[PDB]
Amino acid sequence: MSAKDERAREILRGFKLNWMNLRDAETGKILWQGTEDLSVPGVEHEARVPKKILKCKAVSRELNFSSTEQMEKFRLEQKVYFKGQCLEEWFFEFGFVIPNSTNTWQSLIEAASQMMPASVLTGNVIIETKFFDDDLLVSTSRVRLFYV
Ligand SMILES: O=C1c2ccccc2N[C@@H](c2ccccc2F)N1c1ccccc1
Ligand SMILES: O=C1c2ccccc2N[C@@H](c2ccccc2F)N1c1ccccc1
């Protein structure tokens, strides 16, 4: 049990994802929204998203979260997995987080390559999100996607 380990757990303990939504970055229109804390490690979350999203050049994400702990460099590593193989990857940086703050994080997400159809993908995709303060691994969460 290292000091780094202990810190990560404290950051996790104080971390909460409050709400999120996703939008076509052209229409600016809602594809998905929720208040389920999809960041929660150790369970497979499920999420229903519209087949239409696969057709988007890019997706805009708004994400609201709280943190009792201060973070130097708060960032995510995300991966699409399809039947256990990684198709795509992203790195996003929020940076500095003030202790006891609530914050709304806007990102833009681009698809790199050709999409298999929804019917093939549905229930076979997992999105893995790793939450880091700099080099420190705080949490790893998984979401399975059904396309509807
Ligand atoms: O950014 C997120 C996200 C953020 C916090 C926690 C889990 C996340 N997983 C996915 C995501 C977002 C919205 C709905 C389902 C979903 F799996 N996700 C996402 C959306 C698009 C591309 C990659 C990851
Ligand atoms: O399901 C996918 C997806 C499926 C196969 C290959 C890459 C994927 N990445 C994202 C996604 C889809 C469409 C446009 C951008 C994008 F990042 N994506 C997605 C959609 C909703 C929420 C999170 C990720």
From Swiss-Prot:
Keyword check for Cytoplasm: yes
Membrane topology: Peripheral membrane protein
Keyword Transport: no
A cellular component annotation (GO) from this entry: cytosol
Annotated GO biological process: visual perception
Chain intervals for the UniProt region annotation (Required for association with membranes): 142-148
GO MF entries: GTPase inhibitor activity; small GTPase binding
Places the protein is found: Cytoplasm, Cytosol; Cytoplasmic vesicle membrane; Cytoplasm, Cytoskeleton, Cilium basal body
Residues passing through the membrane, by range: none
Keywords: Cell projection, cGMP, Ciliopathy, Cytoplasm, Cytoplasmic vesicle, Cytoskeleton, Joubert syndrome, Membrane, Sensory transduction, Vision
Tissue: Widely expressed. Detected in various tissues including spleen, prostate gland, testis, ovary, small intestine, colon, retina, and peripheral blood.
Known role: Promotes the release of prenylated target proteins from cellular membranes. Modulates the activity of prenylated or palmitoylated Ras family members by regulating their subcellular location. Required for normal ciliary targeting of farnesylated target proteins, such as INPP5E. Required for RAB28 localization to the cone cell outer segments in the retina. Modulates the subcellular location of target proteins by acting as a GTP specific dissociation inhibitor (GDI). Increases the affinity of ARL3 for GTP by several orders of magnitude.
Involvement in disease: Joubert syndrome 22: A disorder presenting with cerebellar ataxia, oculomotor apraxia, hypotonia, neonatal breathing abnormalities and psychomotor delay. Neuroradiologically, it is characterized by cerebellar vermian hypoplasia/aplasia, thickened and reoriented superior cerebellar peduncles, and an abnormally large interpeduncular fossa, giving the appearance of a molar tooth on transaxial slices (molar tooth sign). Additional variable features include retinal dystrophy, renal disease, liver fibrosis, and polydactyly.
Family recorded in the similarity comment: Belongs to the PDE6D/unc-119 family.
Subunit structure: Interacts with the prenylated catalytic subunits of PDE6, an oligomer composed of two catalytic chains (PDE6A and PDE6B) and two inhibitory chains (gamma); has no effect on enzyme activity but promotes the release of the prenylated enzyme from cell membrane. Interacts with prenylated GRK1 and GRK7. Interacts with prenylated Ras family members, including RAP2A and RAP2C. Interacts with prenylated RHEB and NRAS. Interacts with prenylated HRAS and KRAS. Interacts with RAB13 (prenylated form); dissociates RAB13 from membranes. Interacts with prenylated INPP5E.
PANTHER family found in the cross-reference section: RETINAL ROD RHODOPSIN-SENSITIVE CGMP 3',5'-CYCLIC PHOSPHODIESTERASE DELTA-SUBUNIT, RETINAL ROD RHODOPSIN-SENSITIVE CGMP 3',5'-CYCLIC PHOSPHODIESTERASE SUBUNIT DELTA
Name this polypeptide is given: Retinal rod rhodopsin-sensitive cGMP 3',5'-cyclic phosphodiesterase subunit delta
